[PDB]
Amino acid sequence: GSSGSSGAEFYDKQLKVLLSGATFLVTFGNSEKPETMTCRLSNNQRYLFLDGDSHYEIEIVHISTVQILTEGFPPGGGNARATGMFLQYTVPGTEGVTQLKLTVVEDVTVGRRQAVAWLVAMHKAAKLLYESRDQSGPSSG
């Protein structure tokens, strides 16, 4: 078996799925109704972008907490069961914290495979981003 040279092929297989961008339902604190938006990662998966009614962007550097909203008990065997998403972040200027929710659209062409795959993928990375460092060198170790 080979350890590796750079990155984790496993985590890399998702990098493509994340960037691709999946459709979800974004709900703003003010808006009570879900709106169809697009969630994708940046070139260096170091920032999140949004496209829709307006130009929105959620910097991962600001994001504090990031968890996935699970309906409940798993329908089948063991998998990345995920129907929704929960992310927390603060904006410079306002007062308090802003959270963003992402759900799977109930349209004919949504791509449950890609969508559900994106959610899990995001969290997965969001874990290494904190649990560990991105670049090995500048660390204070």
With H, G, I as helix, E, B as strand and everything else as coil, classify residue 62.
Answer: coil
Q: What are phi and psi of 19, to 5 degrees?
A: -55, -50
* Cβ neighbour number for residue 10 with a 10 Å cutoff: 9
Query: What one-character DSSP code corresponds to residue 124?
Result: H
Rounded CA separation 6/14 (Å): 15
* Sign of torsion over alpha carbons 61, 65, 71, 72: positive
Report residue 48 as tokens: 């999140």
**Ramachandran region, residue 25 (left: φ > 0; alpha: ψ -120 to 50; beta: rest):** beta
Which amino acid makes up residue 118?
W
Residues 6 or more apart whose CB falls under 8 angstroms from that of 133 comprise 139
CATH numbers and ranges of domains, the chain: 1-141 (2.30.29.160)
